[PDB]
Amino acid sequence: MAPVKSQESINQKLALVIKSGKYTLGYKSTVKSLRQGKSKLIIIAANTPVLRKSELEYYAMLSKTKVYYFQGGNNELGTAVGKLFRVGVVSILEAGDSDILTTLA
Amino acid sequence: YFLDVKCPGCLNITTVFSHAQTAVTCESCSTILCTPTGGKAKLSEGTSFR
């Protein structure tokens, strides 16, 4: 039958990584950080229009690397970041940890 | 209880517990030893009590 079911457990693992993470918050700075080449992972929280979502996909494609399309406007990813973030654009950099990037890869 | 187990493949000795919560990785290699399961964690090692 199954693996083990599970995928939502990425939020819980995301939430520890955020505790003392190096990450970048918001589209303008995630884009500065992405222009830097620095980021390993970006998590895109909302149903961004194609034009906005595909630019990110194009950048991902240039890179190696992952991109998690959460995409739900609910923004439970916002629990990690600070609840305020109703829309979430996150890059993840050196957490002081980071098996996470590997795990979702 | 106390249980001495020996890795069949690795041939190394380790001390694992009977009927554990979690997966048992061998420190001898990161291969499995006793498994978690559907309740009653069991084994795939042999030896006796420590």
Partner: protein
């Protein structure tokens, strides 16, 4: 006695804070860490260790209740027919109040957070 038996079985003080310490910093799970190893070693921890400092734990109880609440809240918004489930929402949210009265009394910031920590986290 109970603590002494496990003292002969394990290996020794100082080493045991370090083995446990890693798993906790990774992400919570006091019960999990504790089922790893080398159990005979882990067995001693309540018996000798005070209990470590940790994020979460008192918060975990509330956190999970809210986690569960949101999922059920969609099922209460959709179709009204839900007569059994609704009480459950009423049981869980409330199990958090029930814990929240004693858990507030030793520390500060549990009082502010705990009230707030229904329907937020």
């Amino acid at each position: 006695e109970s603590v002494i038996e496990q003292i002969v079985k394990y290996a020794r003080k100082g080493l045991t804070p370090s083995q446990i310490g890693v798993l906790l910093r990774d992400a919570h799970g006091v019960t999990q860490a504790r089922v790893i190893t080398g159990n005979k070693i882990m067995r001693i921890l309540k018996s000798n260790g005070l209990a470590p400092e940790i994020p979460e734990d008192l918060y975990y109880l509330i956190k999970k209740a809210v986690s569960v609440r949101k999922h059920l809240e969609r099922n209460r918004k959709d179709k009204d027919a839900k007569f059994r489930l609704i009480l459950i929402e009423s049981r869980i949210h409330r199990l958090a109040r029930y814990y929240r009265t004693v858990a507030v009394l030793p520390p500060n910031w549990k009082y502010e957070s705990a009230t707030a920590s229904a329907l937020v986290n």
